[PDB]
Swiss-Prot record, chain A:
The chain holds residues 75 to 359 of 362 of the full protein. Signal peptide: none annotated. It catalyses: (9Z)-octadecenoyl-[ACP] + H2O = (9Z)-octadecenoate + holo-[ACP] + H(+). One of its GO terms (cellular component) is chloroplast. It comes from Arabidopsis thaliana (Mouse-ear cress). It is found in: Plastid, Chloroplast. Its EC number is 3.1.2.14. This is Oleoyl-acyl carrier protein thioesterase 1, chloroplastic. It is an enzyme of class 3 (hydrolase).
Swiss-Prot record, chain B:
The gene is FATA. The chain holds residues 75 to 359 of 362 of the full protein. GO terms for biological process: fatty acid biosynthetic process. This is Oleoyl-acyl carrier protein thioesterase 1, chloroplastic. It catalyses: (9Z)-octadecenoyl-[ACP] + H2O = (9Z)-octadecenoate + holo-[ACP] + H(+). Plays an essential role in chain termination during de novo fatty acid synthesis. Possesses high thioesterase activity for oleoyl-ACP versus other acyl-ACPs. Substrate preference is 18:1 > 18:0 > 16:1. It comes from Arabidopsis thaliana (Mouse-ear cress).
Length: 266, 265
């Protein structure tokens, strides 16, 4: 993959692998989510950030970016053996954080098959206290980002920015006792952001997955699941089919995530 | 990737991805096993299977894994290019063998090798049978006719008999369940997930201080989408060895047994 001519975005092609596809022999939303993460890391690499991102300033003040929110819309899931091209870029939202956006194209047709936007907040690793992006951080970051606004989701008041409410007991559907295994951890032994997308979708009934395709997912990240936590995944039909989602620790019921999904009849 | 010049083996290059690596920023054995599976599928596509032949489709037969044996000398780093070569062979009426050699693209050194035994099963009744002559002939035009072994050694660890772990196990991870990412395109649990479940009962101390060199895994029974699994391990041993058992958490029906070998980093 490569930076574009202007150096303000990054493109990469992926051939969809046999184990990456589900029952329709097309990429799972988890495979898509993994590719977005991979092209994100390859963009950070190419512009001299750490890949574990962190600029030299925020390493000094032991600071890290963590996802507050992920939003993905898929028009077409690529088939097994298809080539998908993904472009990604980053933008400042002042001291309110950072945004990473993706566009997914059919390499052959050049048609837009999906888009995603993610909101990222600055956190002290150790104390894990959120804070506002600090001055010297912004400057060091703006030289890699378009100066004029560039939005995967430009429509003024669009799905990617809706407030998500808290599912109330009792849930229509549940999957309880979900635990991450070593394959679910990243290189720093934290649970991979993508795992949580799998845990949300686990409480969706098999009838829906069999008769519908996932068109939209929005997921808020409230608190991390540690390697030795257990998770319950709750869903309620709010209607296309729509669902409200809650992931919570299996004991005390501490909220780790909430979200919404929209599904189209095949 | 492509078939080699003589059309009797298949090669493919893979760049190791961010999310494919563990704590040492090298590829997990699960990532390796996924790449073996992908290259095996690309070989099958390249010679016109779908891994059923025409005759097998007529009779509703499938190949299933009996055994996977993997030896890793060096796990490729995040961003490394790894080259994998794979071929198959008839073992007469017993079943088929798929073999793999992993190389460092840059140096061309052999960094790993694997071998797997496949038996023929009626898809519907789930009953094993011996490979018929009509199937054998349809497969011999895609396989080298002289033996080609990833594991040629005289007493190689790839062929050893694996005993049944005795209760009590030294270590266990209880209540393991597959999610939808653990299923293949036909809604069966991916062969690779079972590798993941075996390794879950290895203490974190061993994982932090040792590297996996060898794993042998027998496949007895498949885990269904709504089954639950217990993972058992006992030390049998500077090298550490373990005996492994996966069993259904209720009645304790055996699904897998294996051995692992770990060397101090
Ligand atoms: O982790 C990444 O970089 C991309 C990603 C994928 C899925 C959910 C959240 C998220 O931020
Ligand atoms: O499934 C495949 O094609 C190859 C494979 C991978 C991992 C374990 C067993 C096995 O046969």
């Amino acid at each position: 993959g490569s930076l574009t001519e202007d150096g303000l975005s990054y493109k990469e092609k992926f051939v969809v692998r046999s184990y990456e596809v589900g029952s329709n022999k097309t990429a799972t939303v988890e495979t898509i989510a993994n590719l977005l993460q991979e092209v994100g890391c390859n963009h950070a690499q190419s512009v001299g950030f750490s890949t574990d991102a962190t600029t030299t300033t925020m390493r000094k003040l032991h600071l890290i970016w963590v996802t507050a929110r992920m939003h993905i819309e898929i028009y077409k899931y690529p088939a097994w053996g298809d080539v998908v091209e993904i472009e990604t870029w980053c933008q400042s939202e002042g001291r309110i954080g950072t945004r990473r956006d993706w566009i997914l194209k059919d390499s052959v047709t050049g048609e837009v098959t999906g888009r995603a936007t993610s909101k990222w907040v600055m956190m002290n690793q150790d104390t894990r206290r959120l804070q506002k992006v600090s001055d010297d951080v912004r400057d060091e970051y703006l030289v890699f980002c378009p100066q004029e606004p560039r939005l995967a989701f430009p429509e003024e008041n669009n799905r990617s920015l809706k407030k998500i409410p808290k599912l109330e007991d009792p849930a229509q559907y549940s999957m309880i006792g979900l635990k991450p295994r070593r394959a679910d951890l990243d290189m720093n032994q934290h649970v991979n952001n993508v795992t949580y997308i799998g845990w949300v979708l686990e409480s969706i009934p098999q009838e829906i997955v069999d008769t519908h395709e996932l068109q939209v997912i929005t997921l808020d990240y409230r608190r991390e699941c540690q390697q030795d936590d257990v998770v319950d995944s709750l869903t309620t039909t709010t209607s296309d089919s729509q669902f409200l989602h809650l992931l919570r620790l299996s004991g005390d019921g501490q909220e780790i995530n909430r979200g919404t999904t929209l599904w189209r009849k095949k």
